[PDB]
Amino acid sequence: DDLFVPVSNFDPKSIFPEIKHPFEPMYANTENGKIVPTNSWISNLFYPSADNLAPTTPDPYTLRLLDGYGGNPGLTIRQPSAKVLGSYPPTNDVPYTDAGYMINSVVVDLRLTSSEWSDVVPDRQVTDWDHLSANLRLSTPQDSNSYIDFPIVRGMAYITANYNNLTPQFLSQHAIISVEADEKKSDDNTSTFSGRKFKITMNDDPTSTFIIYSLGDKPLELRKQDNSNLVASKPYTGVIRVAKLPAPEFETLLDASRAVWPTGGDISARSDDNNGASYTIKWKTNSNEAPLLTYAYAHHLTSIDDSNVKRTDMTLQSATKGPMTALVGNEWTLRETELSPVEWLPLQAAPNPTTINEIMTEINKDIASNYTQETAKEDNYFSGKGLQKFAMLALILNKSDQTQLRNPELAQIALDKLKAAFLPYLQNEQADPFRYDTLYKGIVAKAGLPTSMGGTDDLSAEFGHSYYSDHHYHQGYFVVTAAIIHHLDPTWNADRLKAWTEALIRDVNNANDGDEYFAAFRNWDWFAGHSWAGGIKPDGALDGRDQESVPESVNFYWGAKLWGLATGNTPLTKLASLQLAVTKRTTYEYFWMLDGNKNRPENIVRNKVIGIYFEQKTDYTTYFGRFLEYIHGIQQLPMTPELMEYIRTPEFVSQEWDEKLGAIAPTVQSPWAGVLYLNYAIINPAEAYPALRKVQMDDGQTRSYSLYLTATRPHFFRR
């Protein structure tokens, strides 16, 4: 079944008040009929940044555009062979003397510019883009016929530059200490080099070697004008490519593929009938005259179908995902053969019979909560956490044929109260209602918009939701809640509930251009294999996209799956399943690290979680302090059957407990205690259960659901 099909083409303007986002893309080609992505690896290209330092990271190359230092402005390349590591000194709370953060140095390894741009700053435009690529054009402001096109594509092994009537200039912030033209050694006092291939070496550490390929009709005549600049002798028209040579044995490989470059790619996806699914990238190229060489991430290697690609040994370090390996082939198919079996409930739906009465006692008390106080918060995020925790209780009481939690009267109250708490959100009457944005084609909360639009004028309001941050996190809670309501009572406000919920899903995860109201895959990256949280940053996301909470991302796709189940939508159910599987794969490659992980140095691996994750850096911390229960606890909520039975493996949970959390858990006097101990129930439910009866609960967690989840472990017993 084709998984890349619309959820619907319902017009969201009938449900949310229309706006045009007040913060426009500055460098976007507005006449191409395409939508500027808000949470993409290409998103920095569309906006200015301080000193133009915002990076765009196709990987293994890091790029900056018209960054202000080092000389004539252009397309700056950094290829980080080595990282800069820093450590947080030991505290009583975090005593382990390992590394805390990983960053990539900001330096011009090599820049493509022009002699004509000595005293003018080029105009720039993103002329076209797709999920996997963007074409960036730089041109002389007075003369649009003097320009360079750069097709910037995920995984590209060379930088490609189509020069038009410009004098090519190559500069570095390192010294260029040798130039070999057309595979000839030159004398030490030679300062001009002519030919169509240039192998250049820098004085950096470790030593960078780059190869420049000139593919135009005329050769290049390059003069070394100082330690760091090679300048052509006249205007040039033609394609120039530059590749980092990772090691001497790969020179013939790079030579052989010099004439073929990627220009973009088309993605498709299908489920099968054997609990598997796949997604395929068909790379677009200039020609098929030579092999396409493309760098792949670690999780690509473990899931790719080897039947139509060849693996090389050619490797370069990615910015923050470990080593990449070049693959030969115009087409990749990635497979996930083990889709999650999780639906609404734990795999063992009924808790151990000796706990039924206790659990029922706790469920009744939790349902007796003031739902308005606990679900009608100032913001959608904490409201959603509350809505979902009570949705769990309506769910298990109304599937009593499975859960054996039988109490018809309480089951009705639980669903009635949930409906009543949810109804204001459905009617867009909550404290922070949504707007449909015609510019970026999504929905945004009111709070972060200008005062004239009823907002606070603070773009950080609602955790940046109004500037497209964190939609998967926030809307996941509402989708799960809506799916549960619609599953238990398909009649209740059905038409509006369907339109509203599917709008929230389409905002985050629309899979088809035929949906004309929503940008496609706002929060999912098919190349990275995970979600991105960070949205629009007016002066640049200086470390690129970010993502912190893996579980709140999981929670969105679980909710999408639940909605698919509730509506009999097999493509939606299967797409969400596929993304959950890819999520699980990349989580253990890059984010939650088992002993033996090869994508990080040992002193980062021992931290067990990566912390706050960026395209350009990682930081073992949180935004509200460095207690272990914070840093690790964020990767443990919301605890749902998906997180507990499929995502968080007992091997990881036990290693993490062993090395970090076991020692501090009994000393935690905060709601994080509830978080750690419900996580603990994965491996030691017998000990977790009495702890959960007494410690504080996270605000998205209930004691009754916690006991239920614990007592449904196959190895639970009483203590």
224 and 151 both lie in a single domain = yes
201 and 263 both lie in a single domain = no
Output the six-digit token pair for 371. 């739902």
The CATH number of whichever domain residue 157 belongs to comes to 2.70.98.30
Helix (H) or strand (E) holding 336: strand 331-336
- Go through 282-295 and write b for each residue having 16 or more CB atoms within 10 A of its CB, e for each that does not: ebbbbeeeebbbbb
Q: Measured over all CA atoms, what is the biggest interatomic distance in the chain, rounded to whole angstroms?
A: 93
Cα(440)–Cα(443) distance, integer angstroms:
9
The CATH number of whichever domain residue 384 belongs to comes to 1.10.287.1170
Q: Do 359 and 702 meet the contact criterion of CB atoms below 8 Å apart?
A: no
Place of tokens 């858990």: 665
Nearest by Cα to 524 from 556, 479, 501: 556
Q: Which of 67, 366, 525, 552 is catalytic?
A: 552
Angle subtended at Cα 130 by Cα 124 and Cα 136, rounded to the nearest 5 degrees: 15
Q: Give yes or no: 409 in active site.
A: no
Output the six-digit token pair for 713. 């472990």
Measured in whole angstroms, how far is the alpha carbon of residue 417 from the centre of its chain? 35
- Go through 488-525 and write b for each residue having 16 or more CB atoms within 10 A of its CB, e for each that does not: bbeeebeeebbbbbbbbbbbbbbbbeebebbbbbbbbb
378 and 495 both lie in a single domain = no
Domain end call among 228, 243, 258: 258
69 and 202 both lie in a single domain = yes
Q: Determine the 3-state secondary structure of 408 from DSSP.
A: helix
Q: Which of 59, 525, 548, 645 is catalytic?
A: 548
161 and 239 both lie in a single domain = yes
| C-alpha distances in Å from residue 274, one per residue of 303, 325, 412, 574 | 16, 30, 38, 12
The domain of 365 spans 351-391+393-421
Q: Determine the 3-state secondary structure of 140 from DSSP.
A: strand
> Phi, psi (5° rounding) for residue 495?
-65, -45
| C-alpha distances in Å from residue 240, one per residue of 9, 146, 211, 649, 693 | 43, 15, 10, 48, 67
The CATH number of whichever domain residue 709 belongs to comes to 1.20.5.420
Q: Do 508 and 519 meet the contact criterion of CB atoms below 8 Å apart?
A: no
528 and 660 both lie in a single domain = yes
> Phi, psi (5° rounding) for residue 674?
-60, -40
Technique employed here was X-ray
Domain end call among 258, 279, 313: 258
> Phi, psi (5° rounding) for residue 370?
-80, 100
Contacts of residue 276, defined as CB under 8 A and 6 or more positions apart, other chains included, come to 335, 336, 337, 338, 339
Q: Do 595 and 298 meet the contact criterion of CB atoms below 8 Å apart?
A: no
Cα(182)–Cα(33) distance, integer angstroms:
44
Q: Do 158 and 243 meet the contact criterion of CB atoms below 8 Å apart?
A: yes
Q: Give the single-character DSSP code of 122.
A: P
426 and 407 both lie in a single domain = no
Q: Give the single-character DSSP code of 88.
A: P
539 and 405 both lie in a single domain = no
> Phi, psi (5° rounding) for residue 115?
-65, -25
Q: Give yes or no: 548 in active site.
A: yes
428 and 569 both lie in a single domain = yes
Q: Which of 366, 470, 502, 543 is catalytic?
A: 470
Cα(485)–Cα(417) distance, integer angstroms:
11
Q: Do 444 and 435 meet the contact criterion of CB atoms below 8 Å apart?
A: yes
Cα(350)–Cα(353) distance, integer angstroms:
8
| C-alpha distances in Å from residue 292, one per residue of 212, 247, 310, 528 | 18, 19, 10, 20
58 and 185 both lie in a single domain = yes
608 and 686 both lie in a single domain = no
Q: What is the secondary structure of 216-231 as a DSSP string? A: SSS-EEEEEEETTEEE
409 and 493 both lie in a single domain = no
Cα(592)–Cα(647) distance, integer angstroms:
11
Query: Looking at the DSSP assignment, which residues form a beta bridge with residue 75?
Result: 65, 112
Q: Give yes or no: 658 in active site.
A: no
Domain end call among 258, 287, 322: 258
Cα(72)–Cα(112) distance, integer angstroms:
9
* Structural domains counted in the chain: 4
Nearest by Cα to 262 from 227, 237, 236, 296: 296
Cα(719)–Cα(712) distance, integer angstroms:
15
Q: What is the secondary structure of 476-497 as a DSSP string? A: HHHHHHHHHHHHH-TTTTHHHH
